[PDB]
């Protein structure tokens, strides 16, 4: 019992983190097989970052300009290419600690673990969600760029995120491992405003299921509601609309707890309308939306 | 920028987790050098757990009754001894992945990372604090026992916690790696009530420093206070008394932010007296006390 915002074990990803230096810029790279993946803005001075022409900046670069360091051993770069907003440095050595892995582009509301790194060295690991405005609320200082977000499925690491930007509002933007940004963001030091950060409704409900399971029930009410009625209330409170897909995905939690999804929606409705009244659910004074339904099933069943 | 409840990277500890089976009971063990550490209640049936005589139960046990499995390879047990509430199984093979390590008994209010494991397999990693009532608020299902709490100092893993018990109130009790329980708890299925879970005042203040650093300042007031005056208010709100030691430890944050410790104490006082008024600090609607001063300095400086 007890419920915690858990990160996946980082070991398999710790083994893939290297330091990439290009001139004076040092940031993190991901070493999988004989390729090192890193943000392409490694080639930029902070002057370049105002309006960088990456194609033009990259012409000036050679394999030997990219210094890749794995622990305290240097990797020989035998090739370099730009895929969207990431650099792929082909090294002459396959990472002997390469786990089974996939590159996956996640959807907003989906959760993953970030291994925050500096100079190819892991500092800490924390659990994130892709916000519906395609930002993440990370902890990233100078040097953290190229730190990656991942999910682990038994022994296979699905890499979903590489860190690129902090927006002027102190939220974080980045790419999948094919170097395509989440949301409308570009690797340029420019006025980039994120849209409305809406609450991930399906996640809040999953977390309310997790609460009931763990004995926090005070918020369970006598009322039910409808998808349309609930969604009127969701709209007013900047909550993502709830689909039959969301209701289907919550099925097992509904089954395990014997609380219908729409009854829990009515509980959520009252919580939105009446607040917590200074009470707490699983030791939080607001509604948590960075647990997925899959996150609760797998935590409240002990999946390794 | 941005502030996150980060766990240490778990890799070095993932390498030390094994499965220990004794009869029908399976739980987690820690394999360091040629010793496997695990909870001594591995030798108990859930019948034994009501009033176990561990010395008597252990007489009946031989080296070959302890089945230690590291991944999918069996370790030969050549010796077994009881140190307090842990078993030390001497195996014939040194863990080749043994990191530099120490066993340290932590003080209440001190924070550490837990690698929650099942059948010697890591499931997730999360950051904890030793509560002032010597419990932790973990996430632990059946099989999680022998999952360990640790701090990492560069490359050295300080092991501070092994998981043993969930109390009837769903909080968690355990030992240091010498098998001495934190608090008054015993490895017995009996009415064990935890005392008052007081807030770790120094940690809340450190987190308020972290807030100011990260641009959340709304709670900064015009008032200061005294250690004695603040502590009257601390007492009323089940906050740990603040010592000159706590004030000394917050020095660097006070220095970095140019907010005197006692001024921040006055900010905390108003927050205790007036609540948040439905506002949030670093995306929390209550006062976080599971970051230490050392946790903020090292997060808001990017220590690897
Ligand atoms: C331990 C774990 C494993 C997993 F596969 C999915 C989730 C979790 C828990 S959580 N929601 O804090 O990430
Ligand atoms: C990343 C990190 C490293 C460290 F040495 C101490 C703390 C932290 C951040 S925290 N407070 O979330 O654990």
Swiss-Prot record, chains A, B:
Regulation: Inhibited by pyridone-containing alpha-ketoamides compounds 13a and 13b. In turn, alpha-ketoamide 13b (tert-butyl (1-((S)-1-(((S)-4-(benzylamino)-3,4-dioxo-1-((S)-2-oxopyrrolidin-3-yl)butan-2-yl)amino)-3-cyclopropyl-1-oxopropan-2-yl)-2-oxo-1,2-dihydropyridin-3-yl)carbamate) inhibits SARS-CoV-2 replication in human lung cells. Inhibited ex vivo by michael acceptor inhibitor N3. Inhibited ex vivo by compound 11a and 11b.
Topological domains, Cytoplasmic: 1-304
Annotated effect of mutating residue 132 to H: In strain: Omicron/BA.1, Omicron/BA.2, Omicron/BA.2.12.1, Omicron/BA.2.75, Omicron/BA.4, Omicron/BA.5, Omicron/BQ.1.1, Omicron/XBB.1.5, Omicron/EG.5.1
Per UniProt, location of the Glycyl lysine isopeptide (Lys-Gly) (interchain with G-Cter in ubiquitin) cross-link in this chain: 5, 90
Subcellular location(s) of the protein: Host cytoplasm; Host Golgi apparatus; Host nucleus
Active site: 41 (for 3cl-pro activity), 145 (nucleophile)
Tree of life domain: Viruses
Domain called Peptidase C30: residue spans: 1-304
Reactions it catalyzes: TSAVLQ-|-SGFRK-NH2 and SGVTFQ-|-GKFKK the two peptides corresponding to the two self-cleavage sites of the SARS 3C-like proteinase are the two most reactive peptide substrates. The enzyme exhibits a strong preference for substrates containing Gln at P1 position and Leu at P2 position
Function recorded in the entry: Cleaves the C-terminus of replicase polyprotein at 11 sites. Recognizes substrates containing the core sequence [ILMVF]-Q-|-[SGACN]. Cleaves and inactivates human TRMT1, preventing tRNA guanine(26)-dimethylation of tRNAs. May cleave human NLRP1 in lung epithelial cells, thereby activating the NLRP1 inflammasome pathway. May cleave human GSDMD, triggering alternative GSDME-mediated epithelial cell death upon activation of the NLRP1 inflammasome, which may enhance the release interleukins 1B, 6, 16 and 18. Also able to bind an ADP-ribose-1''-phosphate (ADRP).
Subunit structure: 3CL-PRO exists as monomer and homodimer. Only the homodimer shows catalytic activity. Interacts with host FBXO22; this interaction promotes the proteasomal degradation of nsp5.
Name of protein: 3C-like proteinase nsp5
Organism of origin: Severe acute respiratory syndrome coronavirus 2
Residue window of the full protein shown: 3264 to 3567 of 7096
